[PDB]
């Protein structure tokens, strides 16, 4: 029953006595449920250490992974160019899932098309599909560019994009001068960041391979910035602001900043902003190219070094204090522009906040996961705060990244109790946080379940989660936050310290039991 004045949604409507009795009768009669004591015993068994060692002996099964397939990153990279349509050569379910994922994360429209290959393509290939799709997309949505990726189906079939696009151009489906860069992005190699790398390299090679004769390094006096797989608009904003406040002329390549943040003014803009084609054509003219996330832009680095003849700096991701300082110093060295006073004042403010919050941030144990560059930047920033990252997890990390992270940890006294895992999923992390309890977790929304599991053991075993990473579905407008640079460091610091204070306030609230530590001033 419902009261018209107070209408209840599923929670707590399904907590009513009649619904409870219905569910109890259903479980008793038809579900054949295991006894509750047996379920509790199995849960306790899953908590223990022997379950952990049985867990880590897994080599064929993956439970709750943390990574996506390459065409997702390929679509994200394609979205960052002006009037560019992402076009995935394969099945339509891939595109539907990509659009749903990015829609749930950014809460903004995402445009992507596919040729919808079916059993006919499975038997006889999908060149006709590519021709018809290119013609239909150009006729209907009128893009200045079509950026083509592939699914696992097109990779297993062996459908080669070069011949298909050349035939579609030669047979008159699209004009011969229409720019159609492509990339092979198999979903069984690497992760979404590898797809972003492949797509960016494909576009760059499409525009800067046949015109190397008249390019001289440094003619336009600009610096190329490659952001990589970035899901925080604040990072694009902070990079643009930091380079603009210093007098460095830059050319940001593949920026989805404007298209993923469009105003609601009664009209829908299918395209907005993006890197302009003449910026891609003039890219080799720049003084140098700096990769913001070098650990997933390896192929792009190779192409830039070997064809553009740029000496790409060996820089880390501009996260934290030291790495942002190194980034600014390298940019100053390349461009010849000195550091302005505003950046120094911002750094001083960040150090002031660090010294203010060090008392609460000291000695806290974090288990974190995410992408390689983001994870290593977060680990460095945590070590800079006096925190102890006890469990470090990266599903799509290699052994060289593990070596680099271990070298970073060994250079600080706060990384003694730190272990790095590569190739492990979130079930491994659940086992780790159950057997070696940290103070907090740092990751995407998929950790919200792990916390739930910990709460089943007891309030004294619950490990709160902090939502930094991709994707965040259970919170609104967190994609506008900043992670890179000084202001990103301040935002992360504020989030961490306020989460610590919120946890302490929640624990010390019971009257006459723990509220003696419910201090007004913290």
């Amino acid at each position: 029953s419902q009261q018209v004045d107070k209408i209840k949604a599923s929670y707590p409507l399904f907590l009513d006595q009649d619904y409870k009795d219905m569910l109890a009768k259903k479980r008793d009669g038809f579900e054949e449920k295991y006894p509750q004591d047996k379920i509790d015993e199995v849960f306790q068994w899953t908590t223990t250490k022997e379950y952990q060692e049985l867990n880590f002996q897994r080599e064929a099964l993956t439970v709750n992974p943390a990574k996506a397939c390459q065409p997702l990153g390929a679509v994200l990279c394609a979205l960052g160019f002006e009037k560019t349509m992402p076009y995935v050569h394969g099945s339509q379910g891939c595109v539907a899932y990509f659009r749903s994922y990015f829609n749930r994360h950014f809460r903004e429209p995402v445009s992507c098309v596919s040729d919808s290959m079916t059993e006919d393509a499975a038997v006889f290939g999908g060149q006709q599909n590519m021709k018809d799709g290119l013609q239909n997309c150009k006729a209907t949505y009128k893009p200045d560019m079509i950026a083509v990726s592939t699914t696992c189906m097109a990779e297993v079939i062996g459908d080669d994009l070069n011949a298909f696009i050349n035939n579609s151009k030669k047979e008159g489906f699209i004009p011969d001068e229409f720019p159609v860069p492509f990339a092979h992005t198999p979903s069984f190699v690497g992760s979404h960041v590898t797809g972003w790398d492949n797509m960016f390299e494909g576009i760059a090679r499409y525009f800067t391979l046949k015109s190397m004769d008249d390019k001289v390094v440094g003619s336009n006096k600009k610096i190329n910035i490659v952001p990589g797989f970035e899901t925080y608009l604040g990072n694009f904003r902070v990079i643009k602001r930091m380079l603009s406040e210093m007098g460095v002329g830059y050319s940001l390549l593949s920026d989805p900043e404007e298209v993923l943040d469009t105003p609601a003014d009664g009209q829908f803009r299918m395209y907005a902003g993006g890197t302009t084609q003449e910026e891609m054509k003039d890219a080799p003219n720049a003084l140098n190219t700096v990769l913001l996330q070098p650990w997933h832009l390896e192929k792009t680095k190779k192409f830039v070094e070997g064809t553009w003849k740029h000496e790409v700096p060996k820089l880390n991701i501009p996260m934290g204090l030291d790495w942002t300082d190194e980034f600014l110093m390298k940019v100053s060295e390349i461009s010849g522009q000195p550091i302005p006073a505003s950046l120094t004042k911002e750094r001083g403010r960040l150090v002031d906040m660090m010294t203010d919050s060090h008392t609460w941030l000291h000695g806290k144990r974090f288990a974190l996961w995410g992408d390689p560059d983001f994870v290593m930047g977060l680990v460095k920033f945590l070590l800079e705060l006096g925190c102890e990252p006890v469990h470090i997890l990266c599903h799509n990390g290699n052994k060289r990244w593990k070596k680099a992270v271990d070298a970073i940890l060994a250079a600080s006294p706060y990384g003694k109790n730190a272990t790095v895992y590569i190739g492990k999923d979130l079930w491994h992390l659940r086992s780790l946080v159950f057997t070696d309890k940290p103070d907090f977790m740092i990751g995407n929304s998929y950790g919200k379940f792990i916390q739930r599991d910990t709460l089943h053991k007891g309030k004294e075993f619950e490990v709160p989660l902090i939502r930094i990473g991709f994707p965040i579905f259970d919170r609104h407008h967190l994609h506008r936050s900043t992670t890179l640079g000084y202001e990103g460091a301040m935002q992360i610091l504020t989030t961490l310290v306020n989460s610590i204070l919120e946890r302490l306030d929640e624990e010390t609230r019971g009257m006459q039991a723990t509220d003696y530590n419910h201090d007004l001033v913290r």
């Binding site: 079916t118 059993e119 006919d120 038997v123 006889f124």
Partner: protein, 121 residues
Amino acid sequence: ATIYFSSPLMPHNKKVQAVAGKRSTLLGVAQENGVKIPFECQDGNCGSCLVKITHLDGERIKGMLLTDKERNVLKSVGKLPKSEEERAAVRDLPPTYRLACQTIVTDEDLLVEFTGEPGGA
């Protein structure tokens, strides 16, 4: 999947075991077992691989997709009544006559009959 190939050209019907859902079609299964179904193209438009497929286990009939190329070839051959087209379009049920080069083996027992002539008498 158990497939029984039958033909007046074959002295005896053959029983073969096939992996269901393979990218290689019934034509791959026919070729690897030496069943001489006349294959005369590589784009699936000739219709010479026309066969009659009977699902021996009526309960274990698997829904499939009848592609437009197969439908058009079968109409050009004449082995496609309007009732079977409606059944395939609404209930996603395969027709009696199929093309071996475009037929994906399903997990059931099948009887495949061919006369050795190209589709269309």
